[PDB]
Amino acid sequence: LRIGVIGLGRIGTIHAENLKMIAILYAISDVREDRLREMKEKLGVEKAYKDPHELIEDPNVDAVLVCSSTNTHSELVIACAKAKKHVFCEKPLSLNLADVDRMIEETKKADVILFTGFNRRFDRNFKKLKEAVENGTIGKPHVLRITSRDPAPPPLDYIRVSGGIFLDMTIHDFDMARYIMGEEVEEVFADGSVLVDEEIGKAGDVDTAVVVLRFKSGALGVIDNSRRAVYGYDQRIEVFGSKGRIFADNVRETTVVLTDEQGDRGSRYLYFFLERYRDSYLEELKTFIKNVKSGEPPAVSGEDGKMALLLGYAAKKSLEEKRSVKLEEVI
Template identity: 45%
Template sequence: MEKVHAGIIGLGRAGQMHLKNLMTIPEIVIEQVADVFIENVSEHLNDIGITNQTRDYHDILNNPKVDTVFIFTSTNTHEEIVTAAAKAGKNIFCEKPLSMNQVEEASLNVLREVKKAGVKLQIGFNRRMDPQFRNVYEGVRNGKIGTPQIVKVTSRDPDLLPHDLIQRIGGLLFDFTMHDFDMARYMMNSNISEVYAKGGTLIDPTLKDIDDIDTLALVLQFENGTYGLIDNSRRAVYGYDQRVEVFGSEGMLKAENVSNSTVELYNNKNEELQKPLPIFKERYREAYTAEMKAFVRSILKDEPLVAEGRDVIMAQRAAVAAKKSLETGLPQKVDTSYPLE
């Protein structure tokens, strides 16, 4: 069996989850791991048999045994590490987005380095591989609802994040809503061409201190003339609320929340349903593993990447436009061209 020889960069809350998933994939050999606070996880890593540990990710890039790197660091480091990995000739998986900077040229320069190096880069838009959403996507592509006209995406977290974490990962738009921009574009098979945003701090007014919001409503227009609606909240008291709906000329497809049970109770007093799964690690467990397996196939069998440079640029542009719309109160156009064909 051919193998991917991997280096893991970043072992925070997301990185440890991804590491656990990667260890279930037989085609992956984990050669080395890196984290700036490696001492915090060193004992656990030794327990699971990963002894080649370092604080400096450059050690992984200089390791001749490593042909592929998985980057799970905070967003503010992605451009630097992806650029260095490309120059080192490594295939790259990187969590989304490439940047939370409102100037996209830096991200385009990263993608230029990737293209120049001839390596593969997959972006972590894992929701494309969620079984529920994938069924909706395939149904839309197969014409089950005729011509798609409107997509609706609901994405609500179970609770607030610490301010210092928010600042490292990009705030609501560049962290949270980034997935929703990509999902809307993915479902409609068209680039977002205009964004109109309304948002504020209905839950935690102190978020204003770090220039962030907790509640957001978006209207999108796509390049093909169709429309999208996105609503976000940082606190849904009933669990992790994740839903997608696509309406078309001949019907509708939708994916509802996932819970631990499909049992529903109805009687003459009320109805009782299970709450949605409480956190992203559980809700998207299958999707996280599926995106890694797809990336491995793209390396070993040259299959198409699940999400690549173009996809992250389009999502980042939509986030920038949404931020400008929040600031101006006006709809904002989104550039749909891509200069790196």
């Protein structure tokens, strides 16, 4: 299976390189010429195109990974529908809802897979907890807890065009909530503060947030987010149900424990992007390919992307109105 990748930023590059551990990297494309040939050589790719559309039209290209900037997503995904190429699109699909509907509509017409880039679904720990809950191991779920904290904020100029913490960061946790609980959120309440850097405040965003979710069954969820955990990534999930509790913890660098007069000390948490995420991207990409090879529905759909976006809008509205907000209000 021949794959073409568009956009060789940090994530496009991970996917491009991961291909040799899977299906074939057959084409790359990026608007920086330097990087383009550098990578054509480095990775040994058959074709390099500086214009995304050529790559989409090359008949040896069975599927496209769109990993370009966000403003670019709608156009390229719609272009793949045209060429009748299956398409994976990195997070987020779009921040504009009408664009999302078109991406969904157009790919549906072309009868081509649209896979949304929610990589955490393929984290081995989160996927295992997902399966156990779905298998009945904690009975009927009552309360979901998600904590998601990054080691540092992204750049301010980024934050300014990000759509805020609920669209840029909580998006992954909204998707995770639906995935793990296996039912829709109907209502959201959100609050957020500026506790890490005054500039995030001046940009109109928050760096610390809590979101409550009310699911169709009556089960409740709480997400909490922070842009700066000094100890590294903190991404934990818990589900509590009629028959017990299940929890997914962080991964540490090592299994080594030092004991001195103050007690035990474990190893540092995962802190760096690649050590934290490379396996989830690898496993996500293999699933996208598996889906294409078998003409399966995508493991993560355009719909999934749209619901996550809608929950983000409900939370932005809740934050401003100081009340919980039903998803209707926002569709």
